[PDB]
Amino acid sequence: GYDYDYLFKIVLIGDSGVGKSNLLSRFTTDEFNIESKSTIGVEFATRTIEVENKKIKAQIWDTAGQERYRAITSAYYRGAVGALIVYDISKSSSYENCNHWLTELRENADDNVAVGLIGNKSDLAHLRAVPTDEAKNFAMENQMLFTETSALNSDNVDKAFRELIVAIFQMVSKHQVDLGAPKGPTISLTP
Amino acid sequence: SRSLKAMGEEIWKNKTEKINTELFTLTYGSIVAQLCQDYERDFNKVNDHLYSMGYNIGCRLIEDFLARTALPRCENLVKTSEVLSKCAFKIFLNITPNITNWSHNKDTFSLILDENPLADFVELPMDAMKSLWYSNILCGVLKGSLEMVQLDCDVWFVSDILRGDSQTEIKVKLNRILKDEIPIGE
Amino acid sequence: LPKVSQSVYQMLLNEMVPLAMGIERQISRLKIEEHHTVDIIRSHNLIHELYKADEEEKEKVLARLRNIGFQIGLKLSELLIFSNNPNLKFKEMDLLLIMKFICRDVWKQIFGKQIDNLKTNHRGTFYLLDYDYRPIQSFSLEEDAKNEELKMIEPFLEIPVGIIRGVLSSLGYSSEEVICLASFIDRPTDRPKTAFPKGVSFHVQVT
Amino acid sequence: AIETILVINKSGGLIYQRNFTNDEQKLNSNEYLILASTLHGVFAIASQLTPKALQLTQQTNIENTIPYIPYVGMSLGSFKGDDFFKEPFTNWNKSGLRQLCTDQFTMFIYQTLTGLKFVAISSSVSTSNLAIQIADNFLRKVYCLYSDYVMKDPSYSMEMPIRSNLFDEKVKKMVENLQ
Amino acid sequence: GIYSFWIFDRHCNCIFDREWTLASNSASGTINSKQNEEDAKLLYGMIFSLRSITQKLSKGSVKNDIRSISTGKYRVHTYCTASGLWFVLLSDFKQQSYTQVLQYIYSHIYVKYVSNNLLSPYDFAENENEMRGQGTRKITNRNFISVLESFLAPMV
């Protein structure tokens, strides 16, 4: 089923323990091999979507590095075209690492890469360790989309994901246009 | 490569040492005799201690059976039954159990011990005629071996010639094929 | 004539010290077999438990395994007398002939090799020297902890002592006049260095 | 007897899965994406596994040169002559996954200097070095055909899925002679 | 000859480690040292991944297993057994394969000093908490190290 016209690589990069494993578990085409995060550094999700008649395949790579993965974790961003910075609104420590995460992303990955920023587990209203106002202000200063997500607050991550892909498409879509025979006997006029 | 027949005869004839079966029978008989002796003849659950015996034996015998045979990991009950019937016993005890009594949808089968070297000569006491099995170590070894081959089975004795039944049968019903583990790296 | 694999025999003959130690636990890892939850415990755990339990329980397990070996030897006796058919008598005062029989046939049938040379007091006791002692040729703990190895591997020396006691029984002398002790005091004179460093010596007393 | 090929652009992601089998079709199209990306990741992670004996001292820049197999291809496009080349050449991936041999097949790898990867799955199981010498030459013929018929294409964005008929029919002609 | 030799168990753990140095037989090959743990989990991950790929895109009804994994600098011979035991060995090419040597290792060294070693454990992960791989209960059997050194000394 090789009907998709384009294939966009996007990294679900984020801090350890953030619940990103549960984040991408909702929106999935979950089949085939799983639990490959510890095998090398990554686990894979995919989806085909329709964007004005141009089918687009996505590749969510969920990079993770605990203590030993130093070089290959950076090398996995050789040609990444999207990023999905995952943080959690439960502790300031997770949000503090976003600056370093973006610095590494911009340094290594493709120049002018689309970056979104998702706040997992917003249902918990007891330990809101960072305000949405400050998060939005941080989002302003880099031209990068922002959203917060929860199990009960569904469809937000899905619409943000689709809008991220259609935003990337406008950047890396070169315009493509959809580009009476003589029937009868013949006589040779060659000399 | 080659049939399990050829493999069993080849491994048994020229790749293993030998002793008299009488002496092995004598040793196992001594074990069971003293377990009867020092336990107030509690045949109800001397079988449990013999099961622990057999499990501990089999869990570490499997490393040698696979070392000699070098077969792949069995996946289906058909191949497990074939290998157990045809070479696993032939290497060690030099017997060929017959397989009948196939259950529904290939989840259970029965090992028929035509000749049991563990019981070449026994006449149990009268009180043991409907309590003791005397060969619990065999099914314990089978379960322990299959544990390390990573497939769990409830194995037990249906009948024994020693107690008085016509033939000795060991049901080996599979329970679930527990899967390989993965690193828990977050 | 029918045979059985030496590997399974050797392993079974090795593994009674866990049996003789766990029977004591039952007298004085949970899992289900079919419906009722039985408990099982490893072998090395019980070997270490015997190594460091306490003196009276250690002695009880030692006499336990001696009884096992006594049964085995006494019971295999009649088979060996039938098969080999030596030139012995029921109570032969010439202990040398009995000891030659045990050295030549009993050990040839149990282990794969004839026992090595033997001393001759001619009045009282005898010594039986074994080199490399097949059943425990593949035992070890650590590169450095060799002192603990010989003290932990002690009870495995009883089943041949029990065999000798049993063979002497049902051949005249009973289990009240005969006593035997095993030890590692035998030293490798000139033999090639095998896995286990020390041979074993069975000192047999017979008045 | 090469049965399948597949190529990875620069950062993972399958872009060509034309299978040269009579009729197997066992593997889904979707899972080959995971296949190609996992091969890319394993290529990356095997780099930091050079044993420390050879880490600090290689002294083996004489074997990297690969000999010239005469007529591996057949019996052209931008190229012309009896064969795409005549001289030997040099290895480029000297610390990466070159071969994965297996009871039923063998996966050869050929990495382009820019970063492109070409993967050749062959049913045939050659002392494990002559096999590499055949495979590297053949995969570089495939690479030459790629540069001819995928790079000189207007309707082909960079490092994207390949959708062409000249390329697939040409590589089919290349492989049906190599058996 | 060889450069390093590894045994991994069912529980995704490193049970035996060894690395060599310059071709002296009595080399400075630090045995079961902690710095080797860092470049062991990723080796296990690589082998596990390509084994998963092989079992995935295999055919027939035999469930093949990977034999060797060649790179530019070396090649990794690997022998798997049905009891979830993997024996891995790195080496420069210099010969077709070491499958016979790995089989001899399993059938005359590990079997006869770890499965006939009643006073030494098996299934080294115990009492939960290390069956996944976060454990260190490697082997230290003097006979094992001695015979393995003796057998692998000439092939370097």
Ligand SMILES: *C(=O)CCCCCCCCCCCCCCC
């Ligand atoms: C897939 O490979 C399954 C292999 C079958 C398991 C091997 C069973 C070995 C144990 C046989 C019985 C040994 C004798 C026990 C009595 C002392």
